[PDB]
Design a protein around this nucleic acid. Sequence first.
RNA 1: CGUCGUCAGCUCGUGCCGUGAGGUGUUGGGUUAAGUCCCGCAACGAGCGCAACCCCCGCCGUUAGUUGCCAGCGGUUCGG
Length: 231
Amino acid sequence: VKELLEAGVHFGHERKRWNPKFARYIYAERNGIHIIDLQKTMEELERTFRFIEDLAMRGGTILFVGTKKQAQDIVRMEAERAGMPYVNQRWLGGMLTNFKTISQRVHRLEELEALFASPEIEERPKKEQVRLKHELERLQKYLSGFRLLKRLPDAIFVVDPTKEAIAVREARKLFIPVIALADTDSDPDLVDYIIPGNDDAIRSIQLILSRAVDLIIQARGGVVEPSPSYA
RNA sequence: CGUCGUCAGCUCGUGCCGUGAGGUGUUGGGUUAAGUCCCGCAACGAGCGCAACCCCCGCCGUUAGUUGCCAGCGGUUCGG
Ligand SMILES: [Mg+2]
Ligand SMILES: [Mg+2]
Ligand SMILES: [Mg+2]
Ligand SMILES: [Mg+2]
Ligand SMILES: [Mg+2]
Ligand SMILES: [Mg+2]
Ligand SMILES: [Mg+2]
Ligand SMILES: [Mg+2]
Ligand SMILES: [Mg+2]
Ligand SMILES: [Mg+2]
Ligand SMILES: [Mg+2]
């Protein structure tokens, strides 16, 4: 499932703005930039995917987090495709560590879908319609990929662990294992199942997250053919 | 009951940070009469306050016509 010229796709990036624990995943540094050893990326993609597989084939949830503008859209696609939750927009504080309270907000979200499907009163004032609807779009913006989470994920997949340090933090306090793609600006030891690759180029964000979702469906019940990628 | 003070404020739940007192939220940019609302945010909500719901005055309509009103008719002791 794994493919090999991801070299055409990413080979990583970032100049000495690096974290030095990431030393082991580096072949050399080129155009004043850290160049990620793909042979290591391989060793890892395997061991990571093995974990991913077992989790799919036991029907266990993955939380997908990415909000850096680059990996932003491709998590709505790729996660819906896996029929799994994600946070696309802002990563609210305490989503895992204070789950039940955050979710108490999704009941509100549902409750608006129900109320605003119609009618059960449109004899409520004009302002209130406006007010309530504005709220509705709101929850929808952050909470959309979140509602699929009815229980604490059995794992979480993150695009930038540095950028999503809070996320990795919340998981570790819960023992929720962490999967992440991570370029050279990252603390490796902080990840359980790790994908040492460029995390800023959508070429790469694409390949890795897709093949992830692919392995997710392929072992879950079915197989599928190409999914959406912006050029 | 006064007062600060009709001032925009004071807290809480759980989360997070801190050995701890405590912090966060309630800070921050814009806006408002206002913790008023907007956006941003390790917070996410909730409460007592703000506001709204009640009374008065301003415009209009309807229900009413006496003890109140008199526009036109008729009388009119000259006082609807
Ligand atoms: Mg980065
Ligand atoms: Mg607290
Ligand atoms: Mg201290
Ligand atoms: Mg503590
Ligand atoms: Mg406290
Ligand atoms: Mg205060
Ligand atoms: Mg305070
Ligand atoms: Mg302010
Ligand atoms: Mg005031
Ligand atoms: Mg308020
Ligand atoms: Mg705030």
